[PDB]
Amino acid sequence: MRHRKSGRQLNRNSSHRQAMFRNMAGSLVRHEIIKTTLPKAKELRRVVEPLITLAKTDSVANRRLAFARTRDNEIVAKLFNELGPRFASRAGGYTRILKCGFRAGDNAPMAYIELVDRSE
Amino acid sequence: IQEQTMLNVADNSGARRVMCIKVLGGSHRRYAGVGDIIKITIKEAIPRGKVKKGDVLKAVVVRTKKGVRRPDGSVIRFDGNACVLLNNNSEQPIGTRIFGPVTRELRSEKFMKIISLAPEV
Amino acid sequence: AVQQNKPTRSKRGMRRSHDALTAVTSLSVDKTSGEKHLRHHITADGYYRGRKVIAK
RNA sequence: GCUCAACGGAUAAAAGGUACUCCGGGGAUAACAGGCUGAUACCGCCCAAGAGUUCAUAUCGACGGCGGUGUUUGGCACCUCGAUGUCGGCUCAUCACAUCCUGGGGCUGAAGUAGGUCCCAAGGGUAUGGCUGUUCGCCAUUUAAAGUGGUACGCGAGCUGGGUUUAGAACGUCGUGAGACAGUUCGGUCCCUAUCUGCCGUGGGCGCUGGAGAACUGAGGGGGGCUGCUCCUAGUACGAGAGGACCGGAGUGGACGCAUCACUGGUGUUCGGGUUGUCAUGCCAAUGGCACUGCCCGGUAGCUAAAUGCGGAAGAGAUAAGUGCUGAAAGCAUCUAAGCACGAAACUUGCCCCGAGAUGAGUUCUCCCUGACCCUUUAAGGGUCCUGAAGGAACGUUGAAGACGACGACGUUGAUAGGCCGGGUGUGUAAGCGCAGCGAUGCGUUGAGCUAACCGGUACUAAUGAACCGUGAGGCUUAACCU
RNA sequence: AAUUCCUUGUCGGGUAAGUUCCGACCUGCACGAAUGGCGUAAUGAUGGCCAGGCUGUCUCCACCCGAGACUCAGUGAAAU
RNA sequence: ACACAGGUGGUCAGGUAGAGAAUACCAAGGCGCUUGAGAGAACUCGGGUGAAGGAACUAGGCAAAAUGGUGCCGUAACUUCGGGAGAAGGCACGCUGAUAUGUAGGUGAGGUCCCUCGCGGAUGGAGCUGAAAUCAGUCGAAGAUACCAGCUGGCUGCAACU
RNA sequence: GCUCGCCGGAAGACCAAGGGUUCCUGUCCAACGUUAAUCGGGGCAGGGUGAGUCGACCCCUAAGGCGAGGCCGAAAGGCG
RNA sequence: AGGACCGAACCGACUAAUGUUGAAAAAUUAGCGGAUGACUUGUGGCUGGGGGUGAAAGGCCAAUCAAACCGGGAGAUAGCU
């Protein structure tokens, strides 16, 4: 049974979950605020925040690891150049979840997950 | 060990592959493999051994792949399942010389002769 | 699977006694703009607890 | 003028098969099950010619007799043919006692060991395989024993289909044949989303009399109730020996149930590495996608058994069979009639769990609410304003809690999740650079680099203060207490 | 014996244990020569049996991954 | 009957690996299959992995698990001499370099002659492609490293066989 | 629009049969689409199919069909 | 050369599982058998119901077969419900 177990399946296999969170991390890094469903945002915290924690230290090994966990070189450049120094003082908590209302097609709990030091 | 288990023979008089037809001791005892006595058929035998194919007699398990657990938590696992052949009425070793390792768990009653003859305890 | 006799309109109502909707019963009011919002939700003009958090 | 003899005589004149079958009816009529009965069966008693080394009842009992049970073979045809699935097995059970083991006894043709028979006793327990479709049966090997029956010969809206019970084929036999067989053989479609009762879990509503927050009493109910092997006593008692103690102690197991994850393991698609084929990121290099997680090798948390802990008790009361004491009716006698005492794994408690909806709604502790007006068909009651308390609920972060509710932690006076920091772990010396080499590759930086749900910390993120519900002193009859 | 009722015939084998199988015996209820008799290499999604290997078939299940089942929004049947 | 997991004749056939129209991944092209969001109970379906034992399961190895490639050896009873026979069983498989700055081999440019002097013959041997083997070195736990891809042996009945 | 996955001796493209406007464009969301739908193969309008060389038509014939006369059959009709 | 072998397309349908108010009035998924022949396939044609056709099953003849489907006799008859 589910005792002391992390990880939200979200009714998809592991390959889809990994691909979906890679793409969601890319979109969150690119736009700095996205609307998702609420559990999707909650596990999006867990993928996105170690990327910025890695991106605090800029080295070729760390850029290669970030490219391994994203496969987007623009996102790697943003993590190691634009963000990273911005979140360097922040000891975690780069992500803030603001719960919106409910989706139209399916009654899904909706959220805006955003970067904390958003320019807008 | 279990029923329908093939075992090697440590002792010389017991010959080659043997099969456990019954796990003696207990009403519905399923698995017994440390110092327990099991009824044995001889599935294949060399002629130099005194016992012959198709013969039922007892044995005691001396080596188990499952292995004994020591009091401190140590697990001695012996590769291969082995038995020492015993007479049905007497439960005494037919074989004059025991071969391979034995455990200190076989130190009770007639198995003292087995650990006396066997080299490594 | 099937029923041997038809269930009654009474037993239908007794089964739907526990099938009823639940009211909201409270709406939080944001300090900066007077609009009522679901508690811990955005105000639908873009405000959380005291600040504008989304443009839309 | 008719063996029109089926003799109130269908016609001058008429045999079979159907498992390829079809129609209308019938439980008016058989098969299965239930019902009646109990001839048979099974069990028990009556008498006792006998059998028993002499010695009817230690043990069986002829000839005969009487019952009990529903229980086997039957009888009947009440029911079911506008439908009640058929053996066996698998899974899951429950009851009776005509008791297989374990307990208590009596008699023994019971020296001990071991038995026989009978009484009481239903708390628990009561194999694995070979052959075969099998219940059976034969066997091999266990065990304390591997009970006997009922439950639609329990159980197919639980499972199987070997069996029978269809349509194909063949053999043996019968018949001219179609075909048949209480013969054989090979092959041969087993459907249901649970309304009601019933259970197993888990909630909501109201009640329990002002509203809460706790902690409990225990009326009832459930769970649990098994046993072997060795040693001491003791080679003692018992015995000519051989053998060898129903007492009283100690360990150690088997099967069972409960918990747990410290260990040993398993798993671990959410960690690390190797690697085949291909494609991509411009390319080398490094990585990623896809091929069952591509194939593997290992593996943290969690869960789990095959791992480890624990338990079924000792007691106590009332007893069953049984054994007694005192003791008359019956100066003797007598376990009973008045009395008195022991006596079981059964009963009631003791052990665990549930449990006041225990409408008989219980107890204790604490907190909280003490403002007016109008109408008024007075256990009486309404409407209005003011004031909403203790607390709960909602919302949010969540949990080793959970199908959903429910329950538990925390909500800025904050460690409740995520992130961050440090560690631990797991995998196995990353990338990059340099060096050796013709290169594959090796060596150094380097036990490096990654690391999961784990541990200890940290307000960086989200847990916003509102608001909502809940009230304002609680009904009538017999008491001290002072007015 | 695709045939033998009795029958699981009797023996020998193979197993600890074999109504199956294989090989003999003849006591053919109820084989028999183109309604063909006896053998036969190869062949068979054929019938029966025995081994080696292999494994969750089993002892005895345990964990994991997905699709349902549970909850939420929308549409929304069935037998009886 | 349906915007139904079925059926529907021919044609074309790119790369890499591969015998291949198998299969894996990709081109070009076309799509995510007209309900979604959570949570991660029993149970059901399709899979993965299993300690020890291994057919004890069962009516019956039903199902699952295994074996599986190419090359070289090697191979029984019986036989209708074809078979049986991939019988069974054993070994080697990756990369890099050398042989050989890429070998056998294939395809052939100049040039050289000849002639009925053109889509001619003959001779060349530059370039290109290139299997296999051997030897040494080297990496993993593993080299048909994935997908793909046979389980084998003995006795019988019946029908010769497709 | 950017990433992801899937097929790729097809789930790619073209003919045949069969269907018959389902093609394209604008507009609309009542019924249809197992949900919402702004979308659609839905509704409603308007457009779209250009041949001496491609098919049919045509010239020929196969299996076969029909068959003047004919033969045969109660009529219908059979055969040729 | 092979009614040869292994094996795709192709044709068939041996076991199991799911389905059984299905995606389907016999399918799907794993395995299976043939696949140079007595093969398979397209397009036409022929055979018509006591008839056809049949490597034979009472198979097939439009999800229908010990005698198809449509209309008629026909309101057959029904000592039965």
Q: Do C40 and A112 touch (CB under 8 A)?
A: no
Domains of chain C: total? 1
Q: Are B82 and B61 in contact (CB under 8 A)?
A: yes
Q: Which residue is nearest to nucleotide D143 (CA to C1')?
A: B27
Resolution (A): 3.2
Strand partners, A33: A114
Q: Nearest CA of chain C to the CA of A58: how many Å?
A: 31
All residues at 6 or more sequence positions from B5 whose CB lies less than 8 Å from its CB, including other chains: B19, B20, B81
Q: Are B65 and B76 in contact (CB under 8 A)?
A: no
Q: Are A105 and A27 in contact (CB under 8 A)?
A: no
User: What's the CA gap between B7 and B83, in Å, rounded?
Assistant: 6
Which method was it determined by? cryo-EM
> Can you give the residue range of the structural domain that contains C20?
1-56
Which pair of structure tokens corresponds to residue A87?
């979140």
Q: Do A120 and C55 touch (CB under 8 A)?
A: yes
* Subunits with 3+ C-beta pairs closer than 8 A to C: A
3-state secondary structure of C28: strand
User: What's the CA gap between A73 and A78, in Å, rounded?
Assistant: 9
User: What's the CA gap between B75 and B69, in Å, rounded?
Assistant: 5
Q: Nearest CA of chain A to the CA of C37: how many Å?
A: 10
Q: Which of residues 72-91 of A touch strand G (CB under 7 A)?
A: 72
